[PDB]
Amino acid sequence: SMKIDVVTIFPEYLQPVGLVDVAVHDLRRWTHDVHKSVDDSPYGGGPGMVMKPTVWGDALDEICTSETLLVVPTPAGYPFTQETAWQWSTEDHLVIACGRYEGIDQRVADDAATRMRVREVSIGDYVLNGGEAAALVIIEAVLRLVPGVSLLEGPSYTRPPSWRGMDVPPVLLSGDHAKIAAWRAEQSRQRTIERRPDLLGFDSPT
Amino acid sequence: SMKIDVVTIFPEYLQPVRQSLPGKAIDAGLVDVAVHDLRRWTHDVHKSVDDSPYGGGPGMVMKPTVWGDALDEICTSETLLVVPTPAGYPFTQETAWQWSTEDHLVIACGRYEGIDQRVADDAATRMRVREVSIGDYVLNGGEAAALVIIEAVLRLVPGVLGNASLLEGPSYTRPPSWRGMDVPPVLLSGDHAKIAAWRAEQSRQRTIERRPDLL
Ligand SMILES: COc1cccc(Cn2ccc3ccc(-c4cc(N)[nH]n4)cc32)c1
Numbered sequence: 001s002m003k004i005d006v007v008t009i010f011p012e013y014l015q016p017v018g019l020v021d022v023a024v025h026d027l028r029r030w031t032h033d034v035h036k037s038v039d040d041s042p043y044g045g046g047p048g049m050v051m052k053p054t055v056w057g058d059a060l061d062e063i064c065t066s067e068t069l070l071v072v073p074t075p076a077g078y079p080f081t082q083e084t085a086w087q088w089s090t091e092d093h094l095v096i097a098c099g100r101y102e103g104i105d106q107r108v109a110d111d112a113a114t115r116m117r118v119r120e121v122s123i124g125d126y127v128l129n130g131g132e133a134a135a136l137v138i139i140e141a142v143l144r145l146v147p148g149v150s151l152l153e154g155p156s157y158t159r160p161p162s163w164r165g166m167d168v169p170p171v172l173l174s175g176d177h178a179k180i181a182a183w184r185a186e187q188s189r190q191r192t193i194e195r196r197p198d199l200l201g202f203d204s205p206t
Numbered sequence: 207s208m209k210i211d212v213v214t215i216f217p218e219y220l221q222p223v224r225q226s227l228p229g230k231a232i233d234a235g236l237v238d239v240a241v242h243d244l245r246r247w248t249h250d251v252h253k254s255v256d257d258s259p260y261g262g263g264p265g266m267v268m269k270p271t272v273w274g275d276a277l278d279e280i281c282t283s284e285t286l287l288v289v290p291t292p293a294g295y296p297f298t299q300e301t302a303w304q305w306s307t308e309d310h311l312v313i314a315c316g317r318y319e320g321i322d323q324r325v326a327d328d329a330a331t332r333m334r335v336r337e338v339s340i341g342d343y344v345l346n347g348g349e350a351a352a353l354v355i356i357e358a359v360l361r362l363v364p365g366v367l368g369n370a371s372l373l374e375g376p377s378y379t380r381p382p383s384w385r386g387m388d389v390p391p392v393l394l395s396g397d398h399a400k401i402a403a404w405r406a407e408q409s410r411q412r413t414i415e416r417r418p419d420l421l
């Protein structure tokens with residue numbers, strides 16, 4: 001059984017979501033001023049804004065326990081991989097803190113780490129506008145592994161066997177499991193070399 | 207302008223990002239994102255979009271005839287067809303930059319075990335097709351990947367999303383002291399050359415600790 005809490009200033013963005021419950025919380029519910037200002041300019045200068053630690057601290061205080069795995073998406077995170085998804089799949093409680101602006105004051109994660117396990121993670125080498133899309137990716141990747149729910153995949157085909165003058169590879173129609181297993185292995189390793197040579201320990205392109 | 211068409215059996219999944227589009231950018235015709243239910247192009251009363259894999263195996267494969275009709279209607283020769291897949295080339299910030307000046311992206315979201323390969327192969331004979339992965343994990347389908355790609359691309363298109371190597375280091379804001387933790391004094395020093403050097407060193411350390419692959 002798993003509980004996932006997502007904290008965000010944009011709850012509605014999380015709407016794309018019995019053994020697991022997922023709850024979404026509006027970070028602004030923990031503000032005290034009438035303007036509900038969650039951000040301010042960075043110490044030391046620079047463009048953009050930083051989310052204040054105070055509002056986050058109060059939210060996480062209420063939502064997290066010492067058992068919680070606090071997940072913080074960030075372009076500067078450790079990589080979130082399939083191995084990470086397997087590791088997190090057996091957790092009782094994930095809390096996903098979604099940043100906006102130019103991110104969250106580092107002290108939020110540092111404070112939380114005195115009380116619970118904290119994981120700053122990146123879902124890939126591109127920049128999002130906030131943590132919400134990363135939260136959706138993480139949730140989907142994790143939940144499909146939850147109990148009771150290498151090489152690149154080769155191409156797949158289904159009916160009809162000829163379409164627009166393009167044939168399904170004859171071996172797949174042959175019913176010869178060994179030859180089919182072999183052809184699929186060759187396709188996979190061929191695809192991995194071309195698209196992801198790093199997975200086989202070769203240099204990346206360009 | 208950039209037009210993005212997304213084709214999916216779960217059109218509701220793409221609703222958040224339709225919402226996240228500022229009225230100004232739409233009104234200025236800078237961007238238009240449309241979402242299409244794939245079942246609109248099914249042939250049968252059961253609106254079937256999947257069928258068993260040739261050569262056997264687990265799961266199901268999406269039907270080429272349905273996808274072919276969908277893409278025939280939606281794409282032109284000028285379309286960049288984006289097909290999320292765990293077996294794709296890596297989608298990176300470089301990709302996002304390249305795609306940000308495209309006139310027309312069409313994102314084909316698969317489910318089950320993916321789309322019959324002939325769909326992409328046929329499309330590639332008359333338009334640019336890009337099969338891409340957004341990271342080394344497996345999703346249930348292409349929709350979350352489409353959300354990521356749309357966000358990463360559109361935030362690079364001037365004035366669209368409302369937003370305006372080494373890893374970025376830690377950031378701090380008010381208050382100067384919080385739960386026993388002080389903002390690093392250097393940041394309040396007014397020595398901006400020293401601050402830049404401190405930030406550079408933080409970036410170097412973080413990259414070493416978290417992403418040694420970048421070094
Ligand atoms: C914090 O440093 C940042 C620097 C510039 C922009 C942003 C935007 N932003 C805000 C919160 C946030 C959370 C996650 C992500 C993210 C993660 C991955 N893998 N890509 N993008 C991006 C986020 C942050």
Ligand SMILES: COc1cccc(Cn2ccc3ccc(-c4cc(N)[nH]n4)cc32)c1
Nearest residue numbers: 290291292316317320339340341345347348
């Ligand atoms: C096609 O090969 C597959 C093999 C096993 C499962 C699935 C699930 N699935 C279906 C359609 C689909 C589209 C994209 C993705 C995806 C992309 C990234 N980076 N992770 N996951 C996953 C998808 C597909």
